């Protein structure tokens, strides 16, 4: 069980850790989060009390180093930093643990939610989507645009998701125009899975990371990517059986975790209705269809 200490909390802020959120008051004696489960990526995120504009946060894995948070009054945000002096870090955290200045990662023993949302997400793949090689952790915020969005403007600050475009030469073989547009199996299985992602685990990992960035930061380009990666599978007549079953589980837990009040902005009516009721896979996502119909029957 690892720890992300805070130097201090000089500005009032809502702090999220995975699907949990809590409020810290201005200059409240707060020095971090302890008992963070080892074995998963995590995200620590922020929304300032005075300016709800810009949710921002950091993806990290405590197996890759000792990380802490410190407020920068010049740039006006909570920054993640790495501590290279391990004895110093341990001594700081111990002091703070003995003074009971740290909140506890509140995982229920029965609860597999975070595992289910991050099953295929790997820090090394996050760092290829979010390019900042001098750090072991990755910054994301509400406003970052994707590479695809930047084609239709700071490259260093982009989300480098795999570009999916159904009306592109990459997606459409010459001489198979109708076939490939109406059945995207070629594009899914040969171009994307065999060619670019190499396996379904990497595809699912990017899909899961896109969803989490949409949900936690309201990142619009991430929501577009999530829906595009769902639609590419549902619009393929030929999908490995284990992929369909896993996709059903992935989406079920995403829909389960989504805040009921954000469904208007985070769910695309056309994609979901096509996927659940028209596509080749309309009968392959039983768990997702049941939770969608009971939780969001208005969208459908």
């Amino acid at each position: 069980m690892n720890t992300v200490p805070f130097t201090s909390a000089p500005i009032e802020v809502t702090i999220g850790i995975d699907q949990y959120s809590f409020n810290v008051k201005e200059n409240q004696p707060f020095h971090g989060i302890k008992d963070i489960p080892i074995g998963h990526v995590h995200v620590i995120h922020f929304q300032h009390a005075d300016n709800s504009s810009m949710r921002y946060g950091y993806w990290f894995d405590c197996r890759m180093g000792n990380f802490y948070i410190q407020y920068d009054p010049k740039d006006g945000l909570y920054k993640m930093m790495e501590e290279r002096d391990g004895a110093k870090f341990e001594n700081i955290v111990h002091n703070f643990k003995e003074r009971q200045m740290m909140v506890s990662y509140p995982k229920i023993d029965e609860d597999d939610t975070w595992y289910n949302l991050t099953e295929f997400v790997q820090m090394d793949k996050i760092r290829k989507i979010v390019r900042k090689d001098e750090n072991q952790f990755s910054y994301v915020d509400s406003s970052m645009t994707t590479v695809q969005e930047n084609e239709l403007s700071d490259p260093a600050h982009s989300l480098n998701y795999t570009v999916i475009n159904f009306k592109s030469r990459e997606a459409i073989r010459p001489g198979h125009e109708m076939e490939d547009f109406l059945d995207k199996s070629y594009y899914l299985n040969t171009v994307m899975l065999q060619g670019i992602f190499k396996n379904s685990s990497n595809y699912f990992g990017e899909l899961q990371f896109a969803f989490l960035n949409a949900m936690f930061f309201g990142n619009y380009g991430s929501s577009l990517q999530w829906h595009a990666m769902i639609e590419l599978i549902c619009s393929s007549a030929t999908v490995p059986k284990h992929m369909l079953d896993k996709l059903d589980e992935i989406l079920y837990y995403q829909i389960k975790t989504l805040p009921e009040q954000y469904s208007d902005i985070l769910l695309n009516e056309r994609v979901w209705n096509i996927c659940l009721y028209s596509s080749f896979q309309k009968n392959s996502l039983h768990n997702t269809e049941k939770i969608m119909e009971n939780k969001y029957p208005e969208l459908l």
Partner: protein, 237 residues
């Protein structure tokens, strides 16, 4: 974007453009079977691809053999149309290729866009105009070449005959659409109007009769009266 009455003069500027109408590609007659079920029998069709500035018509005849053993023919017809239009563009010299293709039915947008991916600089556009090009098969010489075809075939026409010698392309297109709207609303009466006078003939190399300027004024008025009369007979006004 879309083509409407606000940007109508664009049709007659010097950017090459083509209208594509797919309404006569897939044509059937519906009939009873011996067991009392219903079946369709395809008949030959055509793609209507028209340059509205010059009157050049690229009439691609769709022979019924293209449907043999195929499913979902109304969907296939849109993709076959897009394939043939793309093939026509590739066959034209670069300086003759269109800068825009305007489809008369919005369901042609995605098929044509996908077939034209190699031509990113050719704009594929819909239109808000309700153009009467479905009535192309009411022109006797066009209907005749389609029905007689025994194999796929492209036939080239000028749908304006020699009118551009005397009028502008705006006026020629206006005359064309009036004639076709009349043929679409009441084919029998429209043909009676166009041929009632035995002394005015259709040249071997033309589609329409050889009316003088004054005779075209009379004809155009008669076509308007017909369209209006039918509008009354229809809605009882």
């Amino acid at each position: 974007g879309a083509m409407n009455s606000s940007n109508y003069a664009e049709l007659f500027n010097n950017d090459i453009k083509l209208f594509v109408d797919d309404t006569n590609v897939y044509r059937v007659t519906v009939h009873k079977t011996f067991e009392g079920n219903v079946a369709t029998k395809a008949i030959n069709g055509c793609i209507f691809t028209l340059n509205p500035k010059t009157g050049h018509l690229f009439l691609k005849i769709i022979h019924t053999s293209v449907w043999a053993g195929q499913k979902r023919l109304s969907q296939l017809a849109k993709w076959k149309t897009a394939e043939e239009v793309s093939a026509l563009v590739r066959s034209l010299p670069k300086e003759e290729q269109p800068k825009q293709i305007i489809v008369t039915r919005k369901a042609m947008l995605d098929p044509l866009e996908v077939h034209m991916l190699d031509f990113p600089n050719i704009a594929i556009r819909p239109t808000e105009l309700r153009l009467p090009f479905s009535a192309a098969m009411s022109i006797d010489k066009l209907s005749d070449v389609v029905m007689k075809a025994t194999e796929p075939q492209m036939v080239l026409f000028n749908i304006y005959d020699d009118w551009l010698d005397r009028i502008s392309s705006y006026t020629a297109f206006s005359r064309l659409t009036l004639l076709l709207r009349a043929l679409k609303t009441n084919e029998e009466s429209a043909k009676m109007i166009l041929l009632s006078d035995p002394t005015i003939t259709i040249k071997s190399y033309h589609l329409w009769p050889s009316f003088t300027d004054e005779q075209w004024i009379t004809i155009e008025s008669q076509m308007r009266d017909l369209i209006l009369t039918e509008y009354g007979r229809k809605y009882n006004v």
